[PDB]
Each structure stands twice: as C-alpha cells, then as structure tokens.
Amino acid sequence: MELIKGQALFLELDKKDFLSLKNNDKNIPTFAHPKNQEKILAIFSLPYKNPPQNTKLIAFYKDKKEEIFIKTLEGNYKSEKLQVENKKIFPPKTIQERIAKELKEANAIYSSYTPKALFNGAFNIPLNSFITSDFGKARTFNEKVASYHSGTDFRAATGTPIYAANSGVVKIAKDRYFAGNSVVIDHGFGIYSQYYHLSKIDVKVGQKIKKGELIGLSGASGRVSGPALHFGILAGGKQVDPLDFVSKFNAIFQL
Numbered sequence: 001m002e003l004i005k006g007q008a009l010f011l012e013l014d015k016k017d018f019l020s021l022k023n024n025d026k027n028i029p030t031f032a033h034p035k036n037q038e039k040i041l042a043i044f045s046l047p048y049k050n051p052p053q054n055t056k057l058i059a060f061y062k063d064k065k066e067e068i069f070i071k072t073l074e075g076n077y078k079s080e081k082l083q084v085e086n087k088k089i090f091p092p093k094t095i096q097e098r099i100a101k102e103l104k105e106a107n108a109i110y111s112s113y114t115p116k117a118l119f120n121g122a123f124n125i126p127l128n129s130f131i132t133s134d135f136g137k138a139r140t141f142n143e144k145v146a147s148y149h150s151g152t153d154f155r156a157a158t159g160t161p162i163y164a165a166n167s168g169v170v171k172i173a174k175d176r177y178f179a180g181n182s183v184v185i186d187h188g189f190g191i192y193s194q195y196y197h198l199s200k201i202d203v204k205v206g207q208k209i210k211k212g213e214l215i216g217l218s219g220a221s222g223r224v225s226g227p228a229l230h231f232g233i234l235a236g237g238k239q240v241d242p243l244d245f246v247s248k249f250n251a252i253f254q255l
C-alpha cells in the first residue's frame with residue numbers, strides 16, 4: 001500500500017482467529033469495524049518528519065501470519081527554504097521548565113489508550129469557516145525538514161465560537177506555551193482532537209462533551225500571526241492531516 005507522510009490509514013483485517021498486530025515489537029491496538037462484523041480496524045500513521053521509507057506490519061493469527069507492506073509517499077505539501085539554519089535557541093529556564101513540563105503532561109495523555117469509542121458518528125468541522133493555513137506547510141534547510149504545521153488553521157476573528165468536532169472526554173483545558181489556550185479531547189482508540197489559541201475555554205478537564213457542543217471561543221493566544229483556530233488530530237500516536245483523517249474516519253463511522 002502507499003501512505004503519504006503525516007497521514008493516517010485505517011487498516012481492515014479479518015477478525016476470526018486474530019491475535020495481534022505489530023510494527024516490529026510495538027503493538028498496535030484494534031477495534032470493531034462497525035458495519036462489517038467479520039472485520040476489525042487499526043489506525044496506522046506515518047510521521048511527517050523523518051518517516052521510514054517503508055513499513056512492514058504483521059497481523060498474527062492462530063493459524064497464520066499476514067504481512068502488510070506500506071510504502072511511504074511524500075505527497076504535495078507546500079514547502080519553503082529556510083534562510084537561517086534553525087539551530088538551538090536559548091530560552092530562559094523559566095520557559096524551558098514550562099515547555100518540558102507541558103510536554104510530559106501531553107505525552108502522558110497521548111499514551112493513555114482508551115479502548116472504546118467515546119465518539120458519536122462522524123466528525124464535523126469545529127466551525128463553518130475556511131482554511132487559512134494548510135496542514136503540512138513545511139520549512140526546510142538542505143531539503144531536511146526542520147518544522148511543519150502540525151494542524152490546520154481556520155479563519156476566525158477573535159471570539160468566533162468553537163464546537164467539539166465529535167463526542168469525547170476533555171483531557172486538557174488550559175493555557176499552554178506553544179498552544180495558547182488549548183483544548184484536547186479523547187475520542188477513544190487513541191484519537192485526540194485539538195483546538196488551540198482560543199480566547200476563551202468553556203470546559204473543564206474530565207468533562208464528557210457532545211459533538212457540536214460549545215468548547216470555547218477562537219482567539220490568538222500563544223499565536224504570533226493573529227486571530228485564528230488551529231485544529232489538530234492525533235491518531236495512531238502521531239499528529240496527522242485532520243481533514244484527510246476526518247474524511248477517512250467518517251467514511252467508516254457515519255451515524
């Protein structure tokens with residue numbers, strides 16, 4: 001198969017006599033294919049930065065092993081050369097400390113696999129706007145990828161209402177350094193949706209939240225380049241293209 005870097009892929013597999021699905025010694029969780037009962041699903045993601053050229057998964061069954069080969073494609077992401085080498089930058093310890101802590105808090109949350117569906121049918125776009133800045137917009141020195149846009153930015157003046165893309169449980173609901181006023185929702189199966197740079201947070205941590213229910217107001221917090229919404233999806237342990245994901249997810253889980 002072929003998968004563009006920074007995208008997710010729903011794998012279909014026979015349920016009967018299935019034992020495990022592996023990427024070398026790392027396990028990959030599985031879940032019910034909701035319409036077809038003889039099948040199960042797993043989410044596989046390739047990182048945008050530094051993906052392997054090829055990947056080989058193994059679906060072990062009681063009676064046989066089934067291999068899956070996935071070729072890593074490059075896609076057609078927008079990309080600009082960097083003038084100045086990125087290098088190490090030297091923030092104050094006070095900030096270093098905050099970042100490093102908020103990172104730990106994030107990694108703990110994103111490696112807390114919920115093995116049931118908390119969602120309710122398809123995802124909807126968090127607001128009825130348009131994309132100002134695409135996912136995957138990269139900045140490169142020597143065609144090595146230094147950074148990229150980990151989400152997608154919608155047009156939103158400060159105070160534009162934002163709605164949960166799908167049902168779930170709120171895991172983050174506070175101001176953070178890079179993300180500004182962040183909200184992150186666990187939808188189950190390692191699928192998290194992200195809403196950043198809010199001007200206002202209207203939810204707590206631990207709160208069960210309905211699809212289309214209000215989670216906050218768009219803003220510009222922690223954002224250099226003005227008011228907007230930054231929407232993100234983490235799935236199969238990686239930041240991925242949110243619209244591409246939504247479209248694949250919905251194709252399967254449509255109400």
Ligand SMILES: NS(=O)(=O)c1ccc(CC(=O)NCC(=O)NO)cc1
Pocket residue numbers: 106149150153178179184194223228230
């Ligand atoms: N979920 S998390 O581990 O806290 C995280 C993911 C991605 C980013 C990346 C970012 O902040 N991009 C900002 C931006 O340019 N918006 O227009 C931060 C934080």
Ligand SMILES: [Zn+2]
Pocket residue numbers: 133149151152153229230231
């Ligand atoms: Zn953004």
